[PDB]
Amino acid sequence: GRPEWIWLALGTALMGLGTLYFLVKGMGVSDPDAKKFYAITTLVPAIAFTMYLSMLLGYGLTMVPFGGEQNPIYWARYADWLFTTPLLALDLALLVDADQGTILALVGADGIMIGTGLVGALTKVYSYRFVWWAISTAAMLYILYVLFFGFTSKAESMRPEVASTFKVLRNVTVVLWSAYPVVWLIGSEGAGIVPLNIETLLFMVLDVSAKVGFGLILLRSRAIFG
């Protein structure tokens, strides 16, 4: 009966619907290249759907003590993000033909961001929580710098239609991702200013927008076509 459950139920529903819709459209398409984008992009909200469900049912939540209090931390989010954020990057990476080393570096950075974020989430010394938060956000910025400067340049060599689709997704990604560290900062994991219920709502709106929103834009485009 935690108050944030209503948002966990809506994120479950939205992610589940989104998965089904993408699966249905995906299995209908025969183009090889398009099927690859569909397979990657249907997996993302799939993973998110299972995690939101678990949390809705009481899993992935633990009490961490810091600030002289017992604080409720949803660690199931990091298990979701660990695998969905690199898959989203792969989507963007395939669109622009990015180099294999570039992708290895991104995913690597991404592993670090999610890994330090979680360590930071679980840290019992208040001050140190933000030390882990800082590194994680530093890793995040590296990724955004690459997608904005690096990937946009590679996109330049693709047809206009492919480059156009990437810019939209690149913008969607940049705007949504940069909002996660601030939410963590002022929410349950950080300053404890925004309450967990509201925080769950914020992450749900970002999550769904970043997965199903991102998906709808990518999968409805001509750009995934070989």
Ligand SMILES: *C/C=C(C)/C=C/C=C(C)/C=C/C1=C(C)CCCC1(C)C
């Ligand atoms: C579907 C989920 C997506 C697209 C999640 C993106 C998540 C981020 C960009 C998260 C970033 C974080 C930081 C920069 C620092 C503190 C902890 C995190 C993990 C909340």
